[PDB]
Design a protein around this ligand. Structure first.
Ligand code: JDK
Ligand code: JDK
Lengths: 206, 212
């Protein structure tokens, strides 16, 4: 049993989303002007626009409680990893605040943290157009761990036919020897890990 | 100009990002994103795309025969074939920049427990293949990764660094007892730049020490 509220200026984006309820809210619902303005130019200068804290404050006041875990996707966040997904999988209430433009006024998260637990997180070292794709990633990774639903890369998998275009499934996998298969898979995992993610085994990255 | 083809058993998953393309980029022939249902290339009445893994284990593996036909039809020799996987090379902003100059990306989205390895191995004998991961967590399939990759790449296509970025602020100058840092209102633009650099350094130390 988990409730996830997603707040966004693009609710349509979240369409790809009884053990869990997922609600999507249009941030602009909490505006008061006819222009429904949620952004403004940054103090101190710079390109693009920043989301005003006022509208966010009103939205989160309505949706959050002191028990809420507020998740704020940002390229400057703490890394979201499998460990994080396991941790959040046992939470009662996630609220995901999706930014657009060049991000959200820092006081939204700072103020919220006086009232609830707040987690500014990055899903990877690349820049998205906004938090919505990150919300989908976080929701996917967490929900598959929810009850009722390691440091190595997985090796290759195969299925029928045993030969295809002159490419054979590795013979050990057809041998029925559970121990030999286990050993081979363990070796494949470690070789793939040293090739693709040597950092996971404590070596320098390329 | 770039064409992106996405192959998936859940084509509706990619409907958001297709819609989110500005008409001007499409009209200019700058970008085209097409989404294909993998089951179009199935061989049997049951439209089977998955089968049990050799060597045993849980879950199912996607059939090479179906994928082989799909990629045969969709790919050319100039294609960059992108295969999301939790066991992939890391997709980063450097990767996004590189792929932003490609003419044709094909993204093969797996489900179940992944795709028979011979699909990528065979494809790699006549095109460039990139098995990539978007982060150290496990998704249910490649579609969310495709969304991420498409967004990260396309925002680098015109008209479609070492440290973490610091905090941003806008009006009002005071909100819930919190003032915007006075330096940002100082009109001392060299000082502002130095303040922002220190915020960046501090945030990187706190959140991502690995980057230093
Ligand atoms: N892991 C991850 C999370 C996100 C994410 C999350 C939320 C929002 C809200 C808006 N954006 C787009 C954006 C954010 C910041 C900038 C400023 N920028 C700093 C980095 C270099 C370029 C200049 C520009 C555009 C977001 C991006 N991307 N990747
Ligand atoms: N960066 C990233 C990309 C993906 C991604 C991409 C494509 C597919 C296709 C299917 N899945 C789901 C899946 C794959 C493998 C396993 C088994 N595996 C063995 C032990 C270790 C834990 C997992 C389980 C489920 C995919 C997942 N997730 N995260």
């Amino acid at each position: 049993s988990m409730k996830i509220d997603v707040v966004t200026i693009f609710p349509e984006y979240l369409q790809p989303v009884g053990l869990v309820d997922v609600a999507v809210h249009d941030l602009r619902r909490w505006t008061h002007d006819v222009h429904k303005s949620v952004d403004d130019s940054p103090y101190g200068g710079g390109p693009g626009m920043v989301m005003k804290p006022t509208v966010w404050g009103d939205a989160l006041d309505e949706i959050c409680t002191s028990e809420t875990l507020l998740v704020v996707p940002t390229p400057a966040g703490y890394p979201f990893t499998q460990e994080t997904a396991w941790q959040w999988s046992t939470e009662d209430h996630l609220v995901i605040a999706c930014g657009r433009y060049e991000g959200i006024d820092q006081r939204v998260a700072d103020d919220a943290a006086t009232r609830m637990r707040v987690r500014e997180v990055s899903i990877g070292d690349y820049v998205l157009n906004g938090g919505e794709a990150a919300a989908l990633v976080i929701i996917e990774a967490v929900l598959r761990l929810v009850p009722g639903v390691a440091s190595l890369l997985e090796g290759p998998s195969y299925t029928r036919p045993p030969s295809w275009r002159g490419m054979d499934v590795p013979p050990v996998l057809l041998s029925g020897d559970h121990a030999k298969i286990a050993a081979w898979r363990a070796e494949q995992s470690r070789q793939r890990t040293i090739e693709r993610r040597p950092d996971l085994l404590g070596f320098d990255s390329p």
